[PDB]
Design a protein around this ligand. Structure first.
Ligand SMILES: [Zn+2]
Length: 217
């Protein structure tokens, strides 16, 4: 099932019982994130392009689940992920991030996140388990991946390209050479992966990681 906004710029698709994928368009470019419905509120993985879209996304999910968004995990310091940091902070939403992401955010003129995530961080919201992992430099110097151990679902972010993507994207701030090693670190860490969510594009499987390594070759 998929719910959208009149405009069409924002949609939320269900992956399973308490896991949904949110997608917003930034001529227009899509960006994926996750919406986690827990017994203690909603938790998002990444916000949106800007404050207008981010606020809209929040209003949408809060209305649907009749709960508040309590936390957001920021996977890197680019607009498509930290675009609405100001909205989150004025709503009492905790914006988790690594210390590195926090400093790059400041440096990119964005209000900065908590900078609390370590290389390996395990968070539990109600009964929903979430693990954050920094695999090394790649698409960006600070990119991290998110893992849901109860579903073996991996949020790759922009470290992972979708099946039909033939372009790596903006590599001005990327570490192309290191990117491959970082993806290998993810593969070595998570042996049995089911679904993989790309920065943008359709949800796939481990094949997406191999596809990205192929592009980097
Ligand atoms: Zn990016």
């Amino acid at each position: 099932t998929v719910i959208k906004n009149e405009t069409g710029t924002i949609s939320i698709s269900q992956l399973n019982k308490n896991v949904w994928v949110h997608t917003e368009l930034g001529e227009a470019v899509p960006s994926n994130g996750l919406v986690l419905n827990t017994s203690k509120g909603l938790v998002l993985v990444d916000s949106s392009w800007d404050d207008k879209l981010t606020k809209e996304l929040i209003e949408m999910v809060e209305k649907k689940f009749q709960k508040r968004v309590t936390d957001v995990i920021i996977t890197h310091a680019h607009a498509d992920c930290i675009g609405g940091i100001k909205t989150l902070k004025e709503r009492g939403i905790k914006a988790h991030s690594t210390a590195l992401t926090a400093e790059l955010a400041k440096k990119n003129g964005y209000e900065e996140p908590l900078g609390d995530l370590q290389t390996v961080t395990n968070l539990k919201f109600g009964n929903m388990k979430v693990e954050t992992f920094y695999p090394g430099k790649g698409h960006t110097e600070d990119n991290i991946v998110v893992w849901l151990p109860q579903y073996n679902i991996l949020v790759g972010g922009c470290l992972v390209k979708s099946t039909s993507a033939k372009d790596l994207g903006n590599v001005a701030d990327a570490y192309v050479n290191e990117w491959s090693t970082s993806i290998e670190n993810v593969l070595k860490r998570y042996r049995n992966i089911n679904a993989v969510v790309p920065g943008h594009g359709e949800v796939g499987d481990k094949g997406l990681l191999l596809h990205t390594l192929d592009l980097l070759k």
